[PDB]
Design a protein around this ligand. Sequence first.
Ligand SMILES: CC(C)C[C@H](N)C(=O)O
Length: 344
Amino acid sequence: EDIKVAVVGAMSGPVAQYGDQEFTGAEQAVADINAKGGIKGNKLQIVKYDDACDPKQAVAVANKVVNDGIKYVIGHLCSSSTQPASDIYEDEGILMITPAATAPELTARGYQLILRTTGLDSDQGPTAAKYILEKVKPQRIAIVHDKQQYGEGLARAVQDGLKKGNANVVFFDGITAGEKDFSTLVARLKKENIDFVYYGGYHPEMGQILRQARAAGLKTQFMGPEGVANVSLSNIAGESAEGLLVTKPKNYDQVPANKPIVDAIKAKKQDPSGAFVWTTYAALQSLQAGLNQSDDPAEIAKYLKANSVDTVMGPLTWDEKGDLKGFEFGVFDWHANGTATDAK
Ligand SMILES: CC(C)C[C@H](N)C(=O)O
């Protein structure tokens, strides 16, 4: 008796790279879980939904999953898409485990059916600020963001951290997502003699900013969050991407015990390097542990909050609001060839 589980993310649109990672991880996890007998004999069946990381489409998707009678959701991805959908799932009694939404508010509203297999920006932001203050020590900082929940949330947190540390933040400003011309911004960076920029947002904009800043001869050091640490960023910025600092989850694809999964994904000519491949795979393993205990969403959530689950990300333990305990974002140097190495 097949068990349907919705896998929701940006399958199309400007940030479709995130959905590619998610689906890659989900497909392999389901194949692996089914290969070993499924859940008590029952196989998992993935039902794909595209919310394009758009808040309006996310609501349309959430209502559809409810209508389709699906009780378990692996997603969504972007915070501004995941938040309005979580409202619906919680009211309808649907379990939702997000492998990528990082805005803190999602789990600060008393909801009982939401969990994450990624960290919090209340940790990612401070991690970036601390590194900037202790290791980089720039003279004239600018903080830029795309005016969307994720990016502006991180930008304000970093701003707060730098202010508390008495760093010199010259200006803070936002740009519009989808914009391709950043000549005004780069000119402001040049006029202001900015040596370091923290950008809160996704790869499409970051890529354009990097390529355009370098084209104008800026030697400015840039830093971004996990949303810009992926191959698409390198595709867009090319050479202009080397030297970029990013905060992101550990390289799970490099832990020895995960090699069989890496090989399986490479054999299908898919890319196993993206962080969301692993947070999504771990989300399915978490759901699996829960389903072995009960098919009721509320019972699964209770079980996961009371017991650890060993996954491709190592043992996961959740607190009462559905967040991972002890999760850490690391600081890495990003390279034009799409890889990341531990920062110094
Ligand atoms: C896919 C990820 C870049 C999403 C991001 N962490 C957010 O909360 O919007």
